[PDB]
Amino acid sequence: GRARALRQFTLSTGKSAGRNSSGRITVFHRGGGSKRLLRRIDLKRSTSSMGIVESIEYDPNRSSQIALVRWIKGKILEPTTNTISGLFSFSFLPGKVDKRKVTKTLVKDVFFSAFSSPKLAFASSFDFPRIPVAGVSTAFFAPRMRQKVRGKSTFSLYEVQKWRTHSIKAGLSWQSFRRQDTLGLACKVDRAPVTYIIASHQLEAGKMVMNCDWS
Amino acid sequence: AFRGKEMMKKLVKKVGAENITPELKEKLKACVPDTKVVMGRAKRGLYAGRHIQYGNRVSEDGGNKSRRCWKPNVQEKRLFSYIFDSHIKVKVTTHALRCIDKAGGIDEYLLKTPYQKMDTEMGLYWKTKVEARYAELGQMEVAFFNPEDEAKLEQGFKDLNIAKKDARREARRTFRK
Amino acid sequence: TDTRLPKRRPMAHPKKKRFKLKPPGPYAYVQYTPGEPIASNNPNKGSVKRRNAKKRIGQR
Amino acid sequence: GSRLGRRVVHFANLPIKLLMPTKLTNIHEFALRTIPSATKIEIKRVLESLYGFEVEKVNTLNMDGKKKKRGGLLIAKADYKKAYVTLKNPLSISGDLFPVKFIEEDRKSKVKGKKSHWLDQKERREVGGY
Amino acid sequence: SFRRKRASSLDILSPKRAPRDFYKGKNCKPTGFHTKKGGYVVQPDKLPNYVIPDLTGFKLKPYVSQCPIEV
Amino acid sequence: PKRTFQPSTIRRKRNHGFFARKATKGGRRVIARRIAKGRHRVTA
RNA sequence: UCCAUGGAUCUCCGAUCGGGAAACCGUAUCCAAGCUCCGUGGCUAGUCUGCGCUCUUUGGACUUUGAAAACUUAGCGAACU
RNA sequence: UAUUCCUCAAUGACCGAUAGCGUACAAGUACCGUGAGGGAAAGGUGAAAAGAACCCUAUGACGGGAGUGCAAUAGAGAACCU
RNA sequence: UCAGUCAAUCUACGCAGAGUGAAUCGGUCCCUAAGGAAACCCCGAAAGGGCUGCCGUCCGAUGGGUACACGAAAGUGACGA
Ligand SMILES: [K+]
Ligand SMILES: [K+]
Ligand SMILES: [Mg+2]
Numbered sequence: 016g017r018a019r020a021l022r023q024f025t026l027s028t029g030k031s032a033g034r035n036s037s038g039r040i041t042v043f044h045r046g047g048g049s050k051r052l053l054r055r056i057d058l059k060r061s062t063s064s065m066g067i068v069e070s071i072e073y074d075p076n077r078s079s080q081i082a083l084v085r086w087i088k089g090k091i092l093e094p095t096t097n098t099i100s101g102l103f104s105f106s107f108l109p110g111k112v113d114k115r116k117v118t119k120t121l122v123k124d125v126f127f128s129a130f131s132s133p134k135l136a137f138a139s140s141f142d143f144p145r146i147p148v149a150g151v152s153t154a155f156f157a158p159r160m161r162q163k164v165r166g167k168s169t170f171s172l173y174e175v176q177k178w179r180t181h182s183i184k185a186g187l188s189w190q191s192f193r194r195q196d197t198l199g200l201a202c203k204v205d206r207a208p209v210t211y212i213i214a215s216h217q218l219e220a221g222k223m224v225m226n227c228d229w230s
Numbered sequence: 231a232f233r234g235k236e237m238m239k240k241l242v243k244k245v246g247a248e249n250i251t252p253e254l255k256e257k258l259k260a261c262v263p264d265t266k267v268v269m270g271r272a273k274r275g276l277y278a279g280r281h282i283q284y285g286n287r288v289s290e291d292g293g294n295k296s297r298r299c300w301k302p303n304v305q306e307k308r309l310f311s312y313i314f315d316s317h318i319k320v321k322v323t324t325h326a327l328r329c330i331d332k333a334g335g336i337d338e339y340l341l342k343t344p345y346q347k348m349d350t351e352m353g354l355y356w357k358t359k360v361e362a363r364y365a366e367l368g369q370m371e372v373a374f375f376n377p378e379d380e381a382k383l384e385q386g387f388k389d390l391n392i393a394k395k396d397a398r399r400e401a402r403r404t405f406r407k
Numbered sequence: 408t409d410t411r412l413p414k415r416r417p418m419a420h421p422k423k424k425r426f427k428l429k430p431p432g433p434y435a436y437v438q439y440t441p442g443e444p445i446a447s448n449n450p451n452k453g454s455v456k457r458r459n460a461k462k463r464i465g466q467r
Numbered sequence: 468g469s470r471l472g473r474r475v476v477h478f479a480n481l482p483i484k485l486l487m488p489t490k491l492t493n494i495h496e497f498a499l500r501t502i503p504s505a506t507k508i509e510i511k512r513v514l515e516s517l518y519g520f521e522v523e524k525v526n527t528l529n530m531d532g533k534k535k536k537r538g539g540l541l542i543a544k545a546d547y548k549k550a551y552v553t554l555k556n557p558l559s560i561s562g563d564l565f566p567v568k569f570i571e572e573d574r575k576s577k578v579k580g581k582k583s584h585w586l587d588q589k590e591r592r593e594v595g596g597y
Numbered sequence: 598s599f600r601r602k603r604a605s606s607l608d609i610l611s612p613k614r615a616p617r618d619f620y621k622g623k624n625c626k627p628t629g630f631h632t633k634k635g636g637y638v639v640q641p642d643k644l645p646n647y648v649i650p651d652l653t654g655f656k657l658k659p660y661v662s663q664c665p666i667e668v
Numbered sequence: 669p670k671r672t673f674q675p676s677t678i679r680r681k682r683n684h685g686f687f688a689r690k691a692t693k694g695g696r697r698v699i700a701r702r703i704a705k706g707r708h709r710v711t712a
Numbered sequence: 713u714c715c716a717u718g719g720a721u722c723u724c725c726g727a728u729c730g731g732g733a734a735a736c737c738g739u740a741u742c743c744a745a746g747c748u749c750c751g752u753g754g755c756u757a758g759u760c761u762g763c764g765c766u767c768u769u770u771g772g773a774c775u776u777u778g779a780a781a782a783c784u785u786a787g788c789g790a791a792c793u
Numbered sequence: 794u795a796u797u798c799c800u801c802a803a804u805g806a807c808c809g810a811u812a813g814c815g816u817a818c819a820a821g822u823a824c825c826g827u828g829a830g831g832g833a834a835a836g837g838u839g840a841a842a843a844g845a846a847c848c849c850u851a852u853g854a855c856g857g858g859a860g861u862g863c864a865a866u867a868g869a870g871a872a873c874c875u
Numbered sequence: 876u877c878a879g880u881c882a883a884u885c886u887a888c889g890c891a892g893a894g895u896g897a898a899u900c901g902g903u904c905c906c907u908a909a910g911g912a913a914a915c916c917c918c919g920a921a922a923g924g925g926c927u928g929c930c931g932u933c934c935g936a937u938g939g940g941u942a943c944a945c946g947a948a949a950g951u952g953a954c955g956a
């Protein structure tokens with residue numbers, strides 16, 4: 016070969032001869048050509064740069080010609096509040112009022128153990144639901160676990176929350192959530208960035224090439 | 231065909247046969263679904279008991295009969311969940327969507343529908359997860375604040391936001407330095 | 408009194424190929440001499456070729 | 468104890484069947500038969516430790532057992548391994564041992580059908596194979 | 598000793614009666630590891646060690662005498 | 669003339685071998701049928 | 713010799729630790745606990761203590777359910793005649 | 794109530810070596826086919842081997858005598874009753 | 876005795892015994908092509924079919940390799956008539 020293409024932009028692919036994944040012919044009258052190698056071409060050109068056309072080469076995979084281009088440019092007292100104006104307790108949202116576990120083995124405990132991990136949760140992954148606070152959304156609220164003995168009213172700035180106004184997220188999948196629950200299961204002087212582009216008419220070596228971005 | 235027994239064998243093998251008393255076995259026999267589901271894609275979606283049907287297509291003049299099928303109206307949708315605060319991507323029939331409308335959402339449907347009617351091991355898993363999260367929510371309470379405290383905490387949050395911004399910019403410029 | 412060390416067994420964990428270690432993007436940073444055209448291949452003193460072929464020629 | 472090695476054998480059971488050599492004097496190598504799952508290092512170490520040989524090299528080859536087929540019925544013998552052991556010093560075998568004289572006398576029944584120079588050796592080393 | 602086999606046992610592939618790249622082996626224990634260059638390295642800890650005590654001057658014999666001594 | 673059987677051991681094992689029959693559902697039924705009949709050569 | 717009961721040894725594929733042209737190849741699983749022997753380090757030096765692996769006991773971490781004629785219950789379902 | 798991959802005992806106006814299972818006998822064997830697959834043949838000396846020492850003629854006894862045995866054309870080497 | 880286009884003393888025929896020696900030869904081993912398959916995901920009355928990549932695994936010579944192990948924004952191995 017007189018001019019081998021640049022080894023960073025040469026890929027190898029076979030021939031199909033019109034045969035699909037099942038092996039049967041779907042496009043007729045193809046097959047038995049010459050051997051080819053695939054060239055990688057920048058068809059996006061989204062990066063805004065300046066370049067010098069180095070050479071115009073031959074590409075067997077397409078009718079036009081390609082061009083090799085080297086690119087030359089491109090701890091304070093928090094407001095602790097002890098006054099609460101009202102307490103709301105989510106005790107009817109389960110839909111059935113029942114006591115809290117720590118003993119007979121129950122159906123719900125069997126179904127919890129059968130679908131649990133291989134080896135509280137209202138944080139980190141999902142956080143506090145917006146529903147709780149739905150009667151009045153723009154109000155600073157402090158969630159807390161309900162205690163058997165009467166609790167304290169001291170509330171620091173870290174323990175008070177308010178969905179701003181931005182939120183008036185991601186999305187789970189019905190059949191692929193169990194797997195995810197299961198743990199997840201300028202350079203130096205000797206270098207030069209170069210790319211392959213589709214050469215235009217009247218574009219020879221030594222010329223300028225621009226990529227422009229929105230202004 | 232004997233789907234209840236083949237699901238009960240898997241559940242027993244997961245949980246350990248020594249762990250269950252005979253009364254718990256008798257109770258667990260009445261929660262595992264014993265429905266007739268054969269098609270593969272109905273075990274991966276919320277179909278609410280709709281299945282395919284194979285029957286005859288009959289011509290008008292000749293009466294000639296040739297085989298055909300009726301398929302359920304399966305649609306892929308995103309349904310909003312109140313306790314997960316996000317969408318769940320499912321393949322529901324419109325029959326299941328209408329039942330969800332009557333129940334009041336996907337979460338309320340999962341709470342209301344009993345274990346035998348879930349038809350599916352993934353349905354059992356999702357009902358169990360939603361019930362566990364609602365039992366977690368059943369032991370919490372929120373406390374609201376007076377407007378003077380509203381203003382005080384708003385001012386405190388403004389102070390912490392502007393101090394964090396100043397300290398972050400100072401750290402960035404010193405690391406640049 | 409041998410202070411020499413024994414040869415060690417190769418490990419069987421999968422190894423990354425050099426195609427995946429290359430940074431992504433359209434640009435390739437090639438070796439550049441600032442007055443000479445860009446060559447597509449730069450063999451050095453350790454690039455030997457056709458060793459099995461020379462073995463077969465010697466056998467024949 | 469077990470800290471001495473990973474593979475320590477106290478009761479070896481490797482069966483070695485010696486093949487009768489052609490000559491009685493100046494024996495430089497000998498052949499033997501054993502089980503197919505034996506290794507050169509196992510044969511060399513058993514022969515050095517148990518009998519007191521001075522082994523130089525061990526060369527092995529596999530053989531199939533003898534078979535007879537009579538159209539559907541098949542009878543056969545077990546597969547074996549043949550080993551050649553080369554000695555560092557020549558050894559010898561006396562004639563008076565049974566059945567050496569019978570072996571030589573039966574072997575010679577089947578096979579019925581001067582100018583020495585200066586610096587010429589007499590007993591040279593006769594080793595075959597690769 | 599001749600023993601009976603089945604005539605269908607001749608169909609089991611053996612490297613003596615196979616193409617040149619067929620490898621079966623004879624259940625020998627390994628002594629080292631293969632290299633990446635087609636060689637082999639013998640690890641000396643995997644070689645067998647034989648503990649044969651000195652048998653000179655031993656008074657016991659392979660057989661037990663069967664002379665008539667007593668009931 | 670060139671006859672139809674041209675032998676090749678690797679091709680024989682790759683088409684009618686034990687693990688080639690064990691790989692698909694038809695060959696597993698072939699193996700079950702052979703064992704039930706009582707053939708000495710279950711696979712080729 | 714033989715019989716009854718209980719023991720010691722008990723290769724490989726099918727097959728399930730990974731690969732595979734079935735009867736072959738490669739394989740010290742991993743982590744806490746407490747014990748004899750082992751070697752090495754450090755003290756003011758005497759029933760002084762502190763570091764390791766190899767192999768042993770007891771647990772728990774990963775997974776290996778599994779075959780089979782007809783009967784039973786389900787799904788799809790012909791054509792000759 | 795249904796069936797028999799299985800076990801134990803019993804019965805037959807069921808068959809009797811071209812019959813009865815494909816197989817009374819080392820048969821899913823030999824053999825045919827790339828493969829799925831197809832698929833045989835072949836029972837009997839005598840009560841007991843006492844299976845014919847010895848002689849003659851041929852290269853060689855399976856022959857002609859002799860002898861064993863009730864009987865030897867009852868004298869065979871996967872085969873000798875009629 | 877059978878087979879050999881024999882009446883054969885001979886033999887690729889019957890009985891018995893013996894014979895194949897490897898750091899370098901040919902394989903095993905490492906690496907991949909065409910191709911095959913698992914996992915994840917997608918589809919489907921069941922059985923199964925697709926997908927092998929954006930982060931991704933195991934096999935597969937008719938080809939590329941011959942005196943440690945680990946890593947790579949370095950070169951390359953590297954090829955027509
Ligand atoms: K019809
Ligand atoms: K008679
Ligand atoms: Mg050899």
Ligand SMILES: [Mg+2]
Pocket residue numbers: 601602
């Ligand atoms: Mg046997």
Ligand SMILES: [Mg+2]
Pocket residue numbers: 613614
């Ligand atoms: Mg050979």
Ligand SMILES: [Mg+2]
Pocket residue numbers: 624
């Ligand atoms: Mg083995």
Ligand SMILES: [Mg+2]
Pocket residue numbers: none
């Ligand atoms: Mg295995």
Ligand SMILES: [Mg+2]
Pocket residue numbers: none
């Ligand atoms: Mg069953």
Ligand SMILES: [Mg+2]
Pocket residue numbers: none
């Ligand atoms: Mg018959």
Ligand SMILES: [Mg+2]
Pocket residue numbers: none
């Ligand atoms: Mg008759």
Ligand SMILES: [Mg+2]
Pocket residue numbers: none
């Ligand atoms: Mg007849």
Ligand SMILES: [Mg+2]
Pocket residue numbers: none
């Ligand atoms: Mg055949």
Ligand SMILES: [Mg+2]
Pocket residue numbers: 845
């Ligand atoms: Mg006679």
Ligand SMILES: [Mg+2]
Pocket residue numbers: 874
């Ligand atoms: Mg009679």
Ligand SMILES: [Mg+2]
Pocket residue numbers: none
């Ligand atoms: Mg003749």
Ligand SMILES: [Mg+2]
Pocket residue numbers: none
């Ligand atoms: Mg003659």
Ligand SMILES: [Mg+2]
Pocket residue numbers: none
């Ligand atoms: Mg002859």
Ligand SMILES: [Mg+2]
Pocket residue numbers: none
């Ligand atoms: Mg011969």
Ligand SMILES: [Mg+2]
Pocket residue numbers: none
């Ligand atoms: Mg070699």
